[PDB]
Amino acid sequence: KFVIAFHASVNTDKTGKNLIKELPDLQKRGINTLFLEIGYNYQWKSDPKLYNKYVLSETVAREIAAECRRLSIDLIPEINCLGHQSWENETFALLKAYPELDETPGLYPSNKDIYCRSLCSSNEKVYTILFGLIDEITEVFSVKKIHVGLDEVFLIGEDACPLCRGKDKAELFAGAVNRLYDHCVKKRGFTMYMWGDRLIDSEDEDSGYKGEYESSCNGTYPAVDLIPKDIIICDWHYDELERYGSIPYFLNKGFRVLPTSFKGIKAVNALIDYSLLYKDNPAMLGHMYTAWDNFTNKNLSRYKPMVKTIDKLKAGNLEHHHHHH
Numbered sequence: 001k002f003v004i005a006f007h008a009s010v011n012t013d014k015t016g017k018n019l020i021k022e023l024p025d026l027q028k029r030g031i032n033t034l035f036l037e038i039g040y041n042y043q044w045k046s047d048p049k050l051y052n053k054y055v056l057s058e059t060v061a062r063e064i065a066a067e068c069r070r071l072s073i074d075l076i077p078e079i080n081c082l083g084h085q086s087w088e089n090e091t092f093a094l095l096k097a098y099p100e101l102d103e104t105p106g107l108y109p110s111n112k113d114i115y116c117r118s119l120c121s122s123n124e125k126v127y128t129i130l131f132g133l134i135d136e137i138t139e140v141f142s143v144k145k146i147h148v149g150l151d152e153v154f155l156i157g158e159d160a161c162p163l164c165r166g167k168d169k170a171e172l173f174a175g176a177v178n179r180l181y182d183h184c185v186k187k188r189g190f191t192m193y194m195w196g197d198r199l200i201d202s203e204d205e206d207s208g209y210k211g212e213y214e215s216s217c218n219g220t221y222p223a224v225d226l227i228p229k230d231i232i233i234c235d236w237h238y239d240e241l242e243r244y245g246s247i248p249y250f251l252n253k254g255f256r257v258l259p260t261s262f263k264g265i266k267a268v269n270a271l272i273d274y275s276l277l278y279k280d281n282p283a284m285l286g287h288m289y290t291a292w293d294n295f296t297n298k299n300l301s302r303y304k305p306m307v308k309t310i311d312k313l314k315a316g317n318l319e320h321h322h323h324h325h
């Protein structure tokens, strides 16, 4: 038996119903788990500063949860709790409402010359806010699971932060993971998921990857030995490679791993094939598909690289049932 998951995003009452459309179909393909990214795109009751009526309401949200439940789909909301506080020249809700919590105050206007802004990982107000959002979203969905993001954190320990300047980037990162863990797991008893790229040494030859996005080039990877190992690592690599050497890196470290793909058809294939080289390790959980080129959630069950490959793994969950007549 295997985890088969799909990553979808939702930010409006519409995009939610689009997803609802595809849940029945996506189930029949074989999806049994839905990672649902929300960010700050829910009408928050718990913080009025981050609320706008033009995003997902409590009603639409309780329907996705309703539908996942009827279809026995493990639902896991995601809020990115450190990096990805902006995209291109739009800064997201938290940092425009709380500019004091920016890790790089006063530096990159309109986000020129950086990938994405990040929150200050040392400022306690961040955790006060984030913990409040994690509690609300896990409530409206009636779930005990949370994905905290933590991918592609390039801005951390920056000189501009009065709070983090000069500090060790890996310890700051491990500090973020461990604060989130203390709330989601220690206090709430949830299961917590995260992206794994910051835990990998890019320069390492067995576990490293080419770029500076799929693996760490800013020295955060030592945090892998400073965080609790019941955290589920979502390990994403979207290029066709003959070896995805970070799967066994995470596995031997004690983590449960969820390999993650995007586009490529073969690239997807190759990840799945290499992940299945460890099929008989239970900490090799399964697989997650992404369709980042799909911005609506319409025909998500038609995502081509998934529909082909999914039976690939569906077989381990077939369950011979025997004639009832």
Ligand SMILES: [Zn+2]
Residues within 6 Å of the ligand: 102, 103, 119, 120, 121, 122, 123, 157, 158, 161, 162, 163, 164, 165
């Ligand atoms: Zn800081």
